[PDB]
Amino acid sequence: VEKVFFVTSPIYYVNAAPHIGHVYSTLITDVIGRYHRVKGERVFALTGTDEHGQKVAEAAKQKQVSPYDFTTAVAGEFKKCFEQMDYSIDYFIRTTNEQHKAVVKELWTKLEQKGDIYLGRYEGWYSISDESFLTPQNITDGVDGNPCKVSLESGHVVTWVSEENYMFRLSAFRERLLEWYHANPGCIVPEFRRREVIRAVEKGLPDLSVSRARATLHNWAIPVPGNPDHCVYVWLDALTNYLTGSRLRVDESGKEVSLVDDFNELERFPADVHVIGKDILKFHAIYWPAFLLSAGLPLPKKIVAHGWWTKDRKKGNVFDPVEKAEEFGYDALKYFLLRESGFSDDGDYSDKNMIARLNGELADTLGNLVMRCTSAKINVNGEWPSPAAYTEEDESLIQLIKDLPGTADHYYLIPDIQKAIIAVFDVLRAINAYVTDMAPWKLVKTDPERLRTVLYITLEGVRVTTLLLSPILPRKSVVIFDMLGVPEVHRKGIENFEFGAVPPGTRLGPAVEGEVLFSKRSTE
Ligand code: MET
């Protein structure tokens, strides 16, 4: 059924400035979003900041500033960061928003009315930096430089907690979560993280503390309805951002104008894809579903958990994203982060490797190809020629180009953006090979009729590969299409995934004396 494609990033704690990693998480959200928009679908990509809680309040206290002023200042830093990265996110949500607060209270009330929240105690370990309850099996010894306990997850300092808290009956949802994981084998990606979650829930689930004593949080939280002494767990608050996002009417400015009663009215909920980091799996794959199940809400379709940490600066080389983007280009940096990093994440992010892939792939494979097929030397009429008869070699390359969109489509749907990039560049490599074999520079004179067929296939290969690379290189793809002189209408739509969609006779865009699409960086 047609609904709005809803893709989300996590909302980041605002205890410290934005850094790489927030950027990576949001980039993944932005690319998935962008790709569905080139497919012609309706999209709503969501991002933002997690502003309540003990972690954030104690960061604000440690800088001698009011939480109100602090959450706002850092929230601003994130927005500026994401503006300057040239994303295309539809809305930036803050948990301090008053409509957000309303949704949390509605969601809470439903959980309670369902008979799934009881007054209890939590006596156990807690990681303030992760806002995470941990069992004794998940802690160990470590340093402050004093002897203390630390979380096995993150290595952050853990503390004992003994509070009367409101408890959520998570243990009641073990069997339904297990049905869900199995009946929908694609709900968690990558597959090995799906197996991790299933093992965790198979071992058993305790109930979860969903409130905290107000003293503990420095009164920087959403109050529990019907009990001002308590505050809603920062994570239940935080996870509710997705439901709140799905219910906000937003204007062209990006300001929210209205909170609708029923999520169905905007056709966004539930999320089609939640992009998260490996460090926040349990909240999304265990807790969030259980809350949704309790309240009677539809579950998300997919949670993709990438190989990075969502939130530790220390981690993995020192790497400012805006500084790099000015050093290497924004599109190029995004390409590199997406190409280099898989799910297990064994990535080499050195300037050596960054230069290798820029020079090698972007310049020599893609850049090269675009200049060859638009050169006054080769393309003397500066147009899309009409092709003659196709040789078997021609047809071998045409087939690859024809098959590319189906293959790239599947990868983006996984989603595995790395694999989709590899698939497109595999075709780009083939096109270069074809072009070397055919030596069109010689054909201009030898055989003009042959050059037409070869030039046409090259142009159409370059077009289609660029369409599929457009969620990754949004600014450069526009330049490419301008050089090829592709009409705007043909720059999106599944219709334009088809080989031959730009007709012969189309005129190439005008050249400039100085322009180069990707400039090779100093050899070091
Ligand atoms: C609902 S996603 C919340 C993520 C968490 N606040 C973090 O920054 O890691």
Which atom of ligand 1 is least distant from the CA of 239?
1
Residues 6+ apart with CB under 8 A from 502: 384, 460, 463, 484, 486, 487, 490, 496
Q: Is the dihedral of CA 233, 235, 238, 241 positive or negative?
A: negative
Half-sphere exposure of 227 (CA within 13 A, CB side): 18
Query: Which of the listed residues 349, 372, 392 is the one where a domain comes to its end?
Result: 349
Asked whether residue 240 falls in the same domain as residue 332, the answer is yes
467 lines ligand 1 (CB under 6 A): no
- Site to substitute for ligand 1 among 7, 9, 13, 93, most atoms within 8 A of C-beta: 13
Helix (H) or strand (E) holding 11: strand 5-13
Region of 64 on the Ramachandran plot (φ > 0 left; ψ -120 to 50 alpha; else beta)? left
Asked whether residue 135 falls in the same domain as residue 170, the answer is yes
385-412 burial string, b = 16+ CB within 10 Å, else e?
bebbeeeeebeebbebbbebbebbbebb
Amino acid of residue 89: I
Closest CA to 282 of 273, 291, 269, 294: 291
SS3 per residue for 256-311: EEEECCCHHHHCCCCCCEEEEEHHHHHHHHHHHHHHHHHHCCCCCCCEEEECCCCC
Helix (H) or strand (E) holding 133: strand 132-134
Which atom of ligand 1 is least distant from the CA of 279?
9
233 close to 212: Cβ distance less than 8 angstroms: yes
Asked whether residue 313 falls in the same domain as residue 358, the answer is no
Q: Is the dihedral of CA 283, 286, 291, 297 positive or negative?
A: positive
310 lines ligand 1 (CB under 6 A): yes
Ligand 1 centroid from CA 416, angstroms? 22
Which atom of ligand 1 is least distant from the CA of 13?
8
Residue 367, SS3 per DSSP: helix
Helix (H) or strand (E) holding 161: strand 158-168
Asked whether residue 391 falls in the same domain as residue 362, the answer is yes
Ligand 1 centroid from CA 500, angstroms? 45
Query: Which of the listed residues 183, 206, 234 is the one where a domain comes to its end?
Result: 234
Q: Tell me, what CATH number does 167's domain have?
A: 2.170.220.10
Query: d(Cα 406, Cα 417) in Å, to the nearest integer?
Result: 14
Ligand 1 centroid from CA 464, angstroms? 37
Q: Could you list the residue range(s) of the whole structural domain that residue 165 is in?
A: 116-234
185 close to 147: Cβ distance less than 8 angstroms: no
Query: d(Cα 440, Cα 435) in Å, to the nearest integer?
Result: 7
Q: Tell me, what CATH number does 301's domain have?
A: 3.40.50.620
Whole-number Cα distances in Å, 340 to 331, 336, 361, 422 = 14, 6, 12, 10
341 close to 307: Cβ distance less than 8 angstroms: yes
First to last CA, the chain: 52
Asked whether residue 340 falls in the same domain as residue 355, the answer is no
93 close to 50: Cβ distance less than 8 angstroms: no
Ligand 1 centroid from CA 94, angstroms? 12
74 lines ligand 1 (CB under 6 A): no
Asked whether residue 357 falls in the same domain as residue 502, the answer is yes
50 lines ligand 1 (CB under 6 A): yes
Which atom of ligand 1 is least distant from the CA of 241?
1
Strands 303-306 and 188-189: parallel
The pair of structure tokens assigned to 359 is: 């020079």
Helix (H) or strand (E) holding 357: helix 351-357
Amino acid of residue 173: F
Strands 256-259 and 227-232: unpaired
Closest residue (by CA) to atom 5 of ligand 1? 12
SS3 per residue for 108-127: HHHHHHCCCEEEEEEEEEEE
236 lines ligand 1 (CB under 6 A): no
Helices first, then strands: H and E counts in the chain? 19, 17
271 lines ligand 1 (CB under 6 A): no
DSSP per-residue string spanning 203-234: H----EE-EEETTTTTT-SPEETTEEEEEE-H
Asked whether residue 213 falls in the same domain as residue 287, the answer is no
Q: Tell me, what CATH number does 395's domain have?
A: 1.10.730.10
Residues 6+ apart with CB under 8 A from 484: 370, 373, 374, 459, 462, 463, 466, 502, 508, 509
Domain count, the chain: 3
Asked whether residue 345 falls in the same domain as residue 371, the answer is no
The pair of structure tokens assigned to 112 is: 């309670």
Asked whether residue 152 falls in the same domain as residue 297, the answer is no
Ligand 1 centroid from CA 298, angstroms? 21
Strands 117-127 and 132-134: antiparallel
Question: 330-340 and 321-328 are packed helices; what angle lies between their axes, rounded to 10 degrees?
Answer: 110
Asked whether residue 174 falls in the same domain as residue 273, the answer is no
Ligand 1 centroid from CA 12, angstroms? 5
Residue 63, SS3 per DSSP: coil
Asked whether residue 433 falls in the same domain as residue 340, the answer is no
How many CB atoms within 10 Å of residue 431? 23
Asked whether residue 189 falls in the same domain as residue 43, the answer is no
46 lines ligand 1 (CB under 6 A): no
116 lines ligand 1 (CB under 6 A): no
49 lines ligand 1 (CB under 6 A): no
Nearest 5°: phi and psi at 301?
-90, -40
Ligand 1 centroid from CA 303, angstroms? 14
Strands 158-168 and 208-209: antiparallel
Query: d(Cα 339, Cα 328) in Å, to the nearest integer?
Result: 15
Query: d(Cα 415, Cα 302) in Å, to the nearest integer?
Result: 9
DSSP per-residue string spanning 430-486: HHHHHHHHH-HHHHHHH-HHHHHHHHHHHHHHHHHHHHHHTTTSHHHHHHHHHHHT-
Residues 6+ apart with CB under 8 A from 12: 18, 22, 25, 48, 49, 50, 78, 310, 311
Outline where 114-189 has alpha helix (H): 174-183
Ligand 1 centroid from CA 397, angstroms? 45
Closest residue (by CA) to atom 7 of ligand 1? 12
The pair of structure tokens assigned to 150 is: 């630390």
Ligand 1 centroid from CA 33, angstroms? 20
Query: Which of the listed residues 349, 367, 402 is the one where a domain comes to its end?
Result: 349
